[PDB]
Amino acid sequence: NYEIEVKDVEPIRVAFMHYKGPAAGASKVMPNVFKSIQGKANGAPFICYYVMDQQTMTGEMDLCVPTAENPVGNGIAVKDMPRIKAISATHIGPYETMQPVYEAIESYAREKNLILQPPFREVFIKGPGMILKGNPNKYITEVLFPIKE
């Protein structure tokens, strides 16, 4: 049970950097976004996935931290992330266990005659800290997959 529902997700101003490579490796790079705004986030950090492969878990994505601040850091800039009408699925546990969440979103979309519209997002509601890793078994990750409206 991934608590699947359709959400009206409002626009978000983010500090971000572009990242190309394995999604798992993004966690080493995300701290640079927080450091650029002196940790002054006004929302949960997330990845916006533009090009991704489910099997290789590698592609092109933006590492995003919601903020009102002007970032100062190499390769950090600001994007106004657009409003999305999105399928929301919530995953509890480590990031390695998340392919089934996407299968559940695809099934839900197919059954409700909704058309998936990348890019999609993983929102780290409860995840690793900059220093403290915490318990990956209790991580809360919200997948937001936009649909055609």
Ligand SMILES: Oc1ccc(C(=S)NCCC(=S)NCCC(=S)NCCCNC(=S)CCNC(=S)CCNC(=S)c2ccc(O)cc2)cc1
């Ligand atoms: O207050 C603070 C302050 C500091 C911090 C810091 S610095 N914390 C530490 C930095 C942070 S925030 N780490 C966060 C966790 C990260 S970045 N994890 C890496 C990514 C995890 N996710 C994976 S490995 C899954 C990747 N997703 C795939 S492979 C899609 C698969 N599905 C696809 S391609 C598909 C499926 C079906 C479709 O129809 C169509 C696409 C935090 C809070």
Ligand code: NA
């Ligand atoms: Na599939």
Ligand SMILES: [Zn+2]
């Ligand atoms: Zn609205």
Ligand SMILES: [Zn+2]
């Ligand atoms: Zn592939």
